[PDB]
């Protein structure tokens, strides 16, 4: 009961949530969120 209903189910939940988060992260490319962080990263080092 512990092996099937606890460890296997936790593995299932972790996998499903990881897949969902990866899907949302790939979706965020269209909005270009990473671009804003990238430019601000290479801009601060210029000022320093």
């Amino acid at each position: 009961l512990i092996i099937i209903g606890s460890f296997f189910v936790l593995n299932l939940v972790l996998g499903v949530l990881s897949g969902e988060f990866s899907k949302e992260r790939e979706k965020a490319k269209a909005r270009g969120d990473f671009q804003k962080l990238r430019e601000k990263q290479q801009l601060e080092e210029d000022l320093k």
């Binding site: 430019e39 801009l43 210029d46 000022l47």
Partner: protein
Amino acid sequence: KQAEHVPPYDVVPSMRPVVLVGPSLKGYEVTDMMQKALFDFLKHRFDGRISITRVTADLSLAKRSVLNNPGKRTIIERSSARSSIAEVQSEIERIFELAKSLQLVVLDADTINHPAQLAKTSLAPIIVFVKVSSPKVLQRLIRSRGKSQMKHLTVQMMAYD
């Protein structure tokens, strides 16, 4: 074809002079600041081989063939006698004689702001570029200076542009 008759060979000094342009118009706070640290490094690293000079006269009107004898006499009292051409030609030989003495020459006048106008003169110098990549950088570079800067804050962008 004697109207222009551009000669294949052109007179150049012994060594190519180096001048500093960018990242904005000369005479401004940052642009004078960027060259201040840069020119300081050259004299220490190239001690015994370099000579840094400062000339305050204009250089834009300097072509290889405009007249037989531009402004030879200052008592002519004509359209060019009272102008600066009486001393413009004098400093050209000063750069010419500086290269003759086998040493590195540095020209940092206030009359150079673009390599295009100096790309057709007799000097044909070396142009060093200190580009600051994105124009947004320049902004906060000048914004931190003081009230002496925002009186002409905007022209710095078109100075780089």
